[PDB]
């Protein structure tokens, strides 16, 4: 059996800038049994029918998992723009897969604020599809060099979601799993 349980039922998820990817091959996949629970608050397939997966044989299945805001789940789709789509995780235009996201306010939100989840805020250019940028270099938004220290025209490129349980659904954490066939 394919280890879809390890991807979806993982205790800890990755940040969107350092998104995890799991290669899945050489196994029997319970495709139609993935969508048996009502927990998925977003299930959008692109290029494939979610009902026609049980009759399709693929060479590889890449499971990309991370955590983003609720209002940013709309960016996990081909041809989207913003901060998550441009600087953190970018899907190609001819994307062939399914995007599965669900609210995880119970786990990924803490009373004092969960600062483990971060997103890239500044970048000199947009990401190419499926490019992961994990550099923590001080961003030089201005003339003078930074020399590894932040100040005027020098900022840290990773901001953190202050995940608290009191936040609105648009600011609560959502665990995303992008299956690519």
């Amino acid at each position: 059996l394919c280890p879809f349980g390890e991807v979806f039922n993982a205790t800890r998820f990755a940040s969107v800038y350092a998104w995890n990817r799991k290669r899945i091959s050489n196994c029997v996949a319970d495709y139609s049994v993935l969508y048996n629970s009502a927990s998925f608050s977003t299930f959008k397939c692109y290029g494939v029918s979610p009902t026609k997966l049980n009759d399709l044989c693929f060479t590889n299945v890449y499971a990309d998992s991370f955590v983003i805001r609720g209002d940013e789940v709309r960016q996990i789709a081909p041809g989207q723009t913003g901060k998550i789509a441009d600087y953190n995780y970018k899907l190609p235009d001819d994307f062939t897969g399914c995007v599965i996201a669900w609210n995880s306010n119970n786990l990924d939100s803490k009373v004092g604020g969960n600062y483990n989840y971060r997103y890239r805020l500044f970048r000199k250019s947009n990401l190419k599809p499926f490019e992961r940028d994990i550099s923590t270099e001080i961003y030089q938004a201005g003339s003078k060099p930074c020399n590894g220290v932040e100040g005027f025209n020098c900022y840290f490129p990773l901001q953190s979601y202050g995940f608290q349980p009191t936040n609105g659904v648009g600011y609560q954490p959502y665990r995303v799993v992008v299956l690519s066939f």
Epitope: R12, V111, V149, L158
Partner: antibody, heavy 119, light 107 residues
């Protein structure tokens, strides 16, 4: 690997301000994803988390010590230090600094320094 | 704050026995737990995080289980290097430690 060494006066007086500095060698303090922590352990008691500083300067404190604790970073010297003011006799403990790749636990620790509080 | 009640306080064991230490959270902490080992006079060493994930370099005889409010650290075959103190730390709301469990030599 990351090596952390604690330094500071081990004989602070009551109501004064306790200051301790952790020298980080082997890894940089102003790059990467690191959570530089302060943990203290009274003699014969359990561990108590003081607070953390992320590589970007953002701090997170134990709520019981939030009003007396300030943890800063000297990026030139690649050190981070802890200041605890209004110190009473109950602040006598062994103080460790530590690195953590997450805001959750501490995987690297220092030898720990003893700080005594008495008149 | 979340209070960690650890049991038993003191534990007598022999080399090769199966040691079980339990940690109880005052409220639901999901699976956000850690286990440390500390010998007298030295710095603590990380054993388990996320309740069940073994820290790199830790012997496989250590195992962490449990979720919600009940957690258990199990040592399959005890060894002389394992006679120390063990703490559980939650990180569901800030970071709180349990009072610890001491594993002593039985005679």
């Amino acid at each position: 690997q990351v090596q952390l060494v604690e330094s500071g006066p081990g004989r602070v007086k009551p109501s004064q301000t306790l200051s301790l500095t952790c020298t980080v060698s082997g890894d940089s303090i102003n790059s990467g994803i690191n959570y530089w922590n302060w943990i203290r352990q009274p003699a014969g008691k359990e561990l108590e988390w003081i607070g953390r500083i992320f590589t970007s300067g953002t701090t997170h404190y134990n709520p019981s010590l939030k009003s007396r604790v300030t943890i800063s970073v000297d990026r030139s010297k690649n050190e981070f230090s802890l200041t605890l003011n209004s110190v009473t006799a109950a602040d006598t403990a062994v103080y460790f600094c530590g690195r953590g790749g997450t805001d959750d636990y501490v995987d690297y620790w220092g030898q720990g320094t003893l700080v005594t509080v008495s008149s | 704050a979340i209070q960690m009640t650890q049991s038993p306080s003191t534990l007598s064991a022999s080399v090769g026995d199966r040691v079980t230490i339990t940690c109880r959270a005052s409220q639901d902490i999901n699976s956000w737990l850690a286990w440390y080992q500390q010998k007298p006079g030295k710095a603590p060493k990380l054993l388990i995080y996320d309740a069940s994930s073994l820290h790199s370099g830790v012997p496989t005889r250590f195992s962490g289980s449990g979720s919600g409010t009940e957690f258990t650290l199990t040592i399959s075959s005890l060894q002389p290097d394992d006679f120390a103190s063990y703490y559980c730390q939650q990180y569901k709301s800030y970071r709180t430690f349990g009072r610890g469990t001491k594993v002593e030599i039985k005679r």
